């Protein structure tokens, strides 16, 4: 039962439903872009992201000797129709690989159920969508209709390997940290991946290694989706909450350690975790109270009780006699723990049976150009480690020295730190 039930081509004609010219609510102007709806609540825009941030409109670098070590610029990437076709197919293929695991099925199901909360209304008896959780889709008659969505995958901005999960803020509300959630825009490319080293002492050393093994891009996307899950349920950790790494005031956010999981997650001390968990549980109670006071809805895309049921389902709320909603500690803790401890990069690594960095705290060695769309290169089931070939065992398919035709090294980062 595939996640993406159509095999889109980029040049397939627009139909205003799942192949459409859209605008995003950046609070400024833009020419429509061609987008593809690959699943309920999830869209793919094969364009370089010059739209989410008005000050990152330019695909050219900061000058030749202005730039960060782990970075890669190519202003022509993703400018042509063949590259957009291929980007679309590559991204689809990674959703299918993820979805083919039970962990991935769970995570993508929680993302689709994770509809951003309708807390846009200034009247506490009235439930309203926040419009930055929508896109504007041009219909066949050439007019615009607003469409709620949970996730957009878009190409990277100027720095091709700066993958991240962004979302539109609110004037007052902290949407990704108040339980509400907001639509998530992942900057991501399936056309590149990172090199790492199989020895831990090497991988965590800035001066050693050329990056012998390649990260499976399904792992990289899953990392971004895990962030997105947190942000859709409005439980992301404030990035100012950091762990001090111990020669340079190096720190790492808790939100990152959590997302990686494994040994790394244990560096977040128990008092602080209890404090976040209590905090988010309180946020959810504020949502339960807001739903209780809602008598009216705005719009007529759905009924008040349709939407209450939607949020009941999202937040796993208990419903008593009056149709009064409450939060049950047990169900809150299971959800919370699902989204923070079960969904983690490290867990994904076990599911995919791939070689991966052992810690979030490593020094990237290199960046490689890849092509995962041909089945002779990469499949849903095996990634690069193709069954019943010489690349099946020992992660040989990720080994850039053995599987050398699937990887072109574009830049070394080692030494430049």
């Amino acid at each position: 039962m595939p996640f993406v039930n159509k095999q889109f081509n980029y040049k397939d004609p627009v139909n205003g439903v799942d192949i459409a010219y859209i605008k995003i609510p950046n609070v400024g102007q833009m020419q429509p872009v061609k987008a593809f709806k690959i699943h309920n609540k999830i869209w793919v825009i094969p364009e370089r992201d010059t739209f989410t941030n008005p000050e990152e409109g330019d695909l050219n670098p900061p000058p030749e000797a202005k730039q960060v070590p782990v970075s890669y610029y190519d202003s022509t990437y993703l400018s042509t129709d063949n590259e957009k076709d291929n980007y679309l197919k590559g991204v689809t293929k990674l959703f299918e690989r993820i979805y083919s695991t039970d962990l991935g099925r769970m995570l993508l199901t929680s993302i689709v159920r994770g509809i951003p909360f309708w807390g846009g209304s200034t009247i506490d008896t009235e439930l309203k969508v926040i419009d930055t959780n929508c896109i504007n889709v041009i219909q066949p008659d050439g007019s615009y209709r607003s469409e709620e969505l949970n996730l957009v995958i878009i190409g990277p901005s100027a720095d091709i390997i700066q993958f991240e999960c962004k979302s539109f803020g609110h004037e007052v509300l902290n949407l990704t940290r108040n339980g509400y959630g907001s639509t998530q825009y992942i900057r991501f490319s399936p056309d590149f991946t990172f090199g790492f080293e199989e020895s831990l002492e090497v991988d965590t050393n800035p001066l050693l290694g050329a990056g012998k093994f390649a990260t499976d891009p399904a792992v990289t996307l899953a990392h971004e989706l895990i962030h997105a899950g947190h942000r859709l349920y409005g439980i992301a950790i404030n990035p100012n909450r950091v762990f001090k790494v111990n020669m340079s005031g190096l720190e790492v956010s808790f939100e990152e350690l959590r997302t990686f999981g494994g040994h790394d997650a244990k560096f977040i001390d128990s008092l602080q975790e209890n404090e976040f968990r209590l905090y988010y549980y309180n946020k959810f109670k504020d949502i339960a109270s807001t739903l209780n006071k809602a008598k009216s809805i705005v719009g007529t895309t759905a009924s008040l009780q349709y939407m209450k049921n939607v949020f009941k389902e999202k937040y796993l709320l208990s419903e008593d006699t009056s149709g009064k909603f409450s939060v049950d500690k047990l169900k809150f803790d299971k959800l919370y723990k699902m989204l923070t401890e079960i969904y983690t990069e490290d867990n994904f690594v076990k599911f995919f049976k791939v070689l991966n960095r052992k810690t979030y705290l490593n020094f990237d060695k290199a960046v490689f150009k890849i092509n995962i769309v041909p089945k002779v290169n990469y499949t849903i089931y095996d990634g690069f480690n193709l069954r019943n070939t010489n690349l099946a065992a020992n992660f040989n398919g990720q080994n850039t020295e053995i599987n050398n035709m699937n990887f072109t090294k574009l830049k070394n980062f080692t030494g430049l730190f």
């Binding site: 960060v68 070590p69 790492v252 020094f363 990237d364 980062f413």
Partner: peptide, 8 residues
Amino acid sequence: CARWTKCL
């Protein structure tokens, strides 16, 4: 800001 070395 993910990636550790990009957020350093």
